[PDB]
């Protein structure tokens, strides 16, 4: 999608892995804010919103919560208190044809700069104030968006490249999504401190013949003590017997 008609995708209700994006060398122009880069997998969020737009090189600094340029203020304005953070990737060769190409459009003329996270698609041509054009292109009345010519050989920061912006917005509702985390191998016959899907304790985790229902995941003993737990990785039920603590 173009910058002014920036495409939005909701990736919520789904676990996404953030580490692979960091290990990518192509997505080198990584400048984002708020949550720590290592802390993406650590935290959970209610929503996962992705915005996408191609722009020139010099516009990397222009589009940010702190810095706002004319193209940044209007086409797509990041929130000042930006909880999500931006990813920028250089894609000059794929986007740009020989001697430039003409497929993307940027919008820069309007009376009012858009509020944060506002999409405007209207092609109504601005009349430059008092002079009414009533929908005809003239010296005062000009088309809101101008054709975007892009090539790596061009000048200071005119190289075209793609930008993807991740916004979390976890405040409203329970955090349905989480980053991948806490994967560890299994050991059976040894007193060990276990954490099986949030179940905290210490004991000997042995193989069990008795089975839960496909519904039920945990299991308690009489007097409300944990007795067996189904293994989340591979669906089988392992019984628990805490290791010996008899006196001497």
């Amino acid at each position, epitope marked *: 999608a173009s910058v002014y008609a920036w495409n939005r995708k909701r990736i919520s209700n789904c676990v996404a892995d953030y580490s692979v994006l960091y290990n990518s060398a192509s997505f080198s122009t990584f400048k984002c804010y708020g949550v720590s880069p290592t802390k993406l997998n650590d935290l959970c969020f209610t929503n996962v919103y992705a915005d996408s737009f191609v722009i020139r090189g010099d516009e990397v600094r222009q589009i940010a919560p702190g810095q706002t340029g004319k193209i940044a203020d209007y086409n797509y304005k990041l929130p000042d208190d930006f909880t999500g953070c931006v990813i920028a990737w250089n894609s000059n060769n794929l986007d740009s044809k020989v001697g430039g190409n*003409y497929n993307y459009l940027y919008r*820069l003329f309007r009376k009012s700069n858009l509020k944060p996270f506002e999409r405007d698609i209207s092609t109504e*041509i601005y009349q*430059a*104030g*008092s*002079t009414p*054009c*009533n*929908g*005809v*292109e*003239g*010296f*005062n*009345c*000009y088309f809101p968006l*101008q*054709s975007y*010519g892009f090539q790596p050989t*061009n*000048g200071v920061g*005119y190289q075209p490249y793609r930008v993807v912006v991740l916004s979390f917005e976890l405040l409203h509702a329970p955090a349905t999504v989480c980053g991948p985390k806490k994967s560890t191998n299994l050991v059976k016959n040894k007193c060990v401190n276990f954490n099986f899907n949030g179940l905290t304790g210490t004991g000997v985790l042995t193989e069990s013949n008795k089975k839960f229902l496909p519904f039920q995941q945990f299991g308690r003993d009489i007097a409300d003590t944990t007795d067996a737990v189904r293994d989340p990785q591979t669906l089988e039920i392992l019984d628990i017997t805490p290791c010996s603590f008899g006196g001497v």
Partner: antibody
Amino acid sequence: VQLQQSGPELVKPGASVKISCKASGYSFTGYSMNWMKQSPEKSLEWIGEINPSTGGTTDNQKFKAKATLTVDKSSSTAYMQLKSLTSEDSAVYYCARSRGDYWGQGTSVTVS
Amino acid sequence: IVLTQSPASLAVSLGQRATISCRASESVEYYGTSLMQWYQQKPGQPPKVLIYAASNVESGVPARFSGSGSGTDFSLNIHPVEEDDIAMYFCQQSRKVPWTFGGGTKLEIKR
């Protein structure tokens, strides 16, 4: 898009002959088919502005005179009828879309 | 508005930058934005436009041309002046009703 314009004129003072600008590939609905004046010197100025969709015209107040700017969208052409003339007003008149990204070939107005 | 344009004849060699300036009668900054227009005309050719407004540039116009200004002071800048960059360059206004161009700004090949 191609602009056609007609044509060579031999008008005498006191008369006025309507100049035609055939639009061809013009959208004729959102590009003010503006009119400007080029003389046998540099001396450029903007003659008038028209709205193909609306119909109202904005004209320079210095020489409002009796220039008739009509959006004849049935033929998709504008028409210069600059009523009342003089030997001084002998210059080429150009018709161009919007600001003038693509002009017309121009007509030789020879008021003598 | 009456726009008078300073030096009206500059000589330019290949690849050499030059500035030909335009001073208006008053500030063109109405509505919070300038409304000057810049046109080039080869001898015997339909004069194309170089700028949308004070700063922008029409599509299909090479980026080697540029220029800007404020109020009643505007100017041009073309670092890569080539053979094609020899024409008559006019400046217009769009705030007050009498939209008027300028005089002459002849560019000639330096030798």
